[PDB]
Amino acid sequence: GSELETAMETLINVFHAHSGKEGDKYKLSKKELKDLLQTELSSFLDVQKDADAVDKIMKELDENGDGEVDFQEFVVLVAALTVACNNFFWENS
Amino acid sequence: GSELETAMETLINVFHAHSGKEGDKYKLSKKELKDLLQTELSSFLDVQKDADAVDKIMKELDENGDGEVDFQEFVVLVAALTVACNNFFWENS
Ligand SMILES: [Ca+2]
Ligand SMILES: [Ca+2]
Ligand SMILES: [Ca+2]
Ligand SMILES: [Ca+2]
Numbered sequence: 001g002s003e004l005e006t007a008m009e010t011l012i013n014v015f016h017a018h019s020g021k022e023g024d025k026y027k028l029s030k031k032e033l034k035d036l037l038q039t040e041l042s043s044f045l046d047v048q049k050d051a052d053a054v055d056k057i058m059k060e061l062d063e064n065g066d067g068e069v070d071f072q073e074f075v076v077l078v079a080a081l082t083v084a085c086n087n088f089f090w091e092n093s
Numbered sequence: 094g095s096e097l098e099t100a101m102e103t104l105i106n107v108f109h110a111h112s113g114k115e116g117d118k119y120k121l122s123k124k125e126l127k128d129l130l131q132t133e134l135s136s137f138l139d140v141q142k143d144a145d146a147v148d149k150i151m152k153e154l155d156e157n158g159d160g161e162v163d164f165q166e167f168v169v170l171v172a173a174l175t176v177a178c179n180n181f182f183w184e185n186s
Contacts, residue, residue: 001107008137008179029130079172
């Protein structure tokens with residue numbers, strides 16, 4: 001099946017849906033990623049309600065203080081945090 | 094939309110489709126991950142043709158030499174490698 005493959009194609013499409021909407025299509029930005037999580041992962045990855053949560057999240061990515069992200073840094077950080085949350089409910093049954 | 098959200102639900106379902114098929118449903122294994130990539134990401138992440146490629150890939154994950162993976166280690170390693178490949182074709186246009 002393409003279920004797992006479809007997983008890579010989908011995050012890449014929404015990624016180019018908002019990332020290229022700001023014009024900076026060659027680099028991601030702090031506001032661009034804010035839209036992607038609050039759009040489909042708002043309930044899981046809290047972010048829209050805690051705007052401070054997005055400043056902290058980009059800080060690990062923008063460790064360079066570039067206020068911009070290379071998108072690759074983003075996938076590794078949120079990938080581990082959300083995956084851990086699913087096991088959190090399963091751990092207590 | 095749930096396109097990005099659907100991305101997390103799909104890799105998690107196939108993950109529990111083969112991971113729980115070996116009985117070791119509490120921990121992933123070297124053969125379990127081999128099936129997930131060769132099943133839907135065979136063409137992108139070469140693996141089935143280069144069985145040596147799977148030994149090397151788990152080595153970074155099983156840096157502990159446990160021949161077993163915590164699944165979380167897996168998502169971060171293959172997440173960055175496949176994402177980079179998509180930009181490889183885009184970089185040369
Ligand atoms: Ca962008
Ligand atoms: Ca950055
Ligand atoms: Ca398993
Ligand atoms: Ca491991």
